[PDB]
Structure 1
Amino acid sequence: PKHGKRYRALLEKVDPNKVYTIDEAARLVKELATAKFDETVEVHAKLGIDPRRSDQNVRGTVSLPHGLGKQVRVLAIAKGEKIKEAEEAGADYVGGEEIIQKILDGWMDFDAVVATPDVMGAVGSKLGRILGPRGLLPNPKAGTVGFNIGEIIREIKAGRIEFRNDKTGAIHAPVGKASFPPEKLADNIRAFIRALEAHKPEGAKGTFLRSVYVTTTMGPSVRINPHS
C-alpha cells in the first residue's frame, strides 16, 4: 500500500545491495519494467557540479546510438529558406514568421523548435516563458540555432538526449522502452556513459560518476558500477 503491489514484487527484485552494471541492467532491467509500456531506462545520472555554478549546466546533446521513440515533429519557425530545410525533414508547420502566432496565440505540438538564428530573435522574443523555460526554444544548442538543425532534426528524432543539471546533474537517460532486450540496452547505456564523458566540466571536483540508476521507471534501480 504505497508504491503499488507490483513494485513490492519489484521490491522482491533489488535487496538494497547491488550494482547490476549495464549488463545486469540490460537483461534484468529488461525484466524490471514488467508493468505497462515504454519506461525509458531512467538512467538517473548524478554528480555534483554545484546545482548552478553559473555555467555548469551541460546541455548533454546525444544521438543515443540506437533510437529515441515517438514524434517530436520539431516544427521549426525558419525564415523562408530554412522552412524548405525543415520541409524535407520530420518537421511540420515551419512558417517562417507566422507559426509564431501558432505557438504564442494558442497552437502547440512540437519539441525543440529548431527555428534559426533570425527567428531566434523573433521567435525567441515571443516565446521565452513556456517553450524555453520548460524545454523547447532556440536555446542556442537545444538543436535550435542554425541550419545544423535539420541534421539535428535527425538528432531530435533518432537520438537527442538533453542533459540539464538542476539539482544532481540529474539526467534521466532515456531509451529501454521495455522491448529492446539486453542488447540495445547494453550498447545504449554505454553510449550514455560516453555522453556524460563527452560533456566534461572545467573544475568540478566531485564524483563524475555516481548515480546512474538504470531503472526503466516503474521498477528497481541500483546504479551500474558507474562506469561499464
Structure 2
Amino acid sequence: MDREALLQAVKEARELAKPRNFTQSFEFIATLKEIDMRKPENRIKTEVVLPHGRGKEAKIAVIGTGDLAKQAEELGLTVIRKEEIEELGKNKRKLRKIAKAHDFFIAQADLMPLIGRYMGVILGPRGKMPKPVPANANIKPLVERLKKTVVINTRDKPYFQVLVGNEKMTDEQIVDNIEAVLNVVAKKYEKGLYHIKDAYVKLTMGPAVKVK
C-alpha cells in the first residue's frame, strides 16, 4: 500500500503490456471490502484533480453568454451560446457528438433550467450535465482544475476503475496521481484505505497488475 509497492505495480503494468501504435493510458482499479453498496451514502461519485493530469487534458465545453462565453473563447474552449441550446435540442445527433467530444460542461447558472429542458435528455444519462457557475464568475481556476480532473464512480458496485495518466508520463507522476485517487477513499470512509481489498494498475491494453 506504500509508494514503493505502487511504483513497482506501475513499472510492471508498463513492462508487461505489449507495445502498440497508440499512447496507452494507465487505469487504477480498486476493489472494496466491508462496504455495503446498497446504501447510497457508501457509493462514490467524486471528482479528483490529478496532480500531474490525465496525460491528455480533459475537454471542457462552456454553455453561456456574455463574459462567460468570452472567457471560454479566451481559454480556447468549446462555447455553446444560449441561442444554441434549443438548436442542439433539435439536433440530437450533433448534441450526442458534442457530448461524446467533451468530458465536462460548465454552464451559466441562470441557464440550467433551459439546458436541462433541451439538452438534459442527452447530457444527463451520460453524467455530463454542466457544473453551474454565477454569470459573473471567473472560470479560469475551475477550467484549470477540470482539465486535470477524473471521476471516481463506483455506482452500486464495490469497486472502481479510474484513469490516472498515460505512458508518456513518469511512474512517479502516475503514483502521485494514484495517491490522489486513494485520498478520496481515505476521506470517505471512517476506516479509510482499510476498505481497499485489492488494487491494480494496468495500461489500456495491458494486463492488470496487483499492487503489493
The TM-score, its normalising length taken from structure 1, stands at 0.72
- Contact 1:74-1:114 within 8 A present in 2 as well: yes
Cα 1:85–1:209 change in 2 (3 A) is same
String of CA shifts for 1:29-68, please: whole Å, max 9, x gaps. Answer: 2213333233332211232643352344433211210012
String of CA shifts for 1:129-148, please: whole Å, max 9, x gaps. Answer: 2212213112xxxxx12147
Superposed counterparts of 1:34-183, under 5 Å: 34-36=18-20, 37-47=22-32, 49-51=35-37, 53-70=39-56, 72-95=58-81, 97-101=82-86, 103-106=88-91, 107=94, 108=98, 109-138=101-130, 144-146=131-133, 147=137, 149-157=139-147, 159-183=148-172
User: Partners of 1:223 and 1:209 in 2: how far apart?
Assistant: 12
Contiguous gaps of at least 5 residues in structure 1: 1-19, 139-143
Residue of structure 1 in register with 2:12 after alignment: 28
User: Partners of 2:140 and 2:125 in 1: how far apart?
Assistant: 22
| Identical amino acids, percent of aligned pairs | 29
Cα 1:163–1:83 change in 2 (3 A) is same
CA RMSD of aligned residues (A): 2.9
The partner residue of 1:219 within 180, 183, 206 is 206
Matched to 2:181, the amino acid is: F
User: Partners of 1:165 and 1:150 in 2: how far apart?
Assistant: 29
Superposed counterparts of 1:189-200, under 5 Å: 189-198=178-187, 200=188
User: Partners of 1:180 and 1:212 in 2: how far apart?
Assistant: 20
Cα 1:84–1:160 change in 2 (3 A) is same
User: Partners of 2:38 and 2:87 in 1: how far apart?
Assistant: 33
Cα 1:171–1:114 change in 2 (3 A) is farther
Choose between structure 1 and 2: higher helix proportion.
Answer: 2
User: Partners of 1:78 and 1:133 in 2: how far apart?
Assistant: 21
Cα 1:207–1:167 change in 2 (3 A) is farther
Cα 1:43–1:168 change in 2 (3 A) is farther
Cα 1:69–1:185 change in 2 (3 A) is closer
User: Partners of 1:191 and 1:87 in 2: how far apart?
Assistant: 30
Residues paired across the two proteins, number: 197
- Contact 2:30-2:199 within 8 A present in 1 as well: yes
SS at match of 1:34: coil
SS at match of 1:87: helix
Choose between structure 1 and 2: higher strand proportion.
Answer: 2
The TM-score, its normalising length taken from structure 2, stands at 0.77
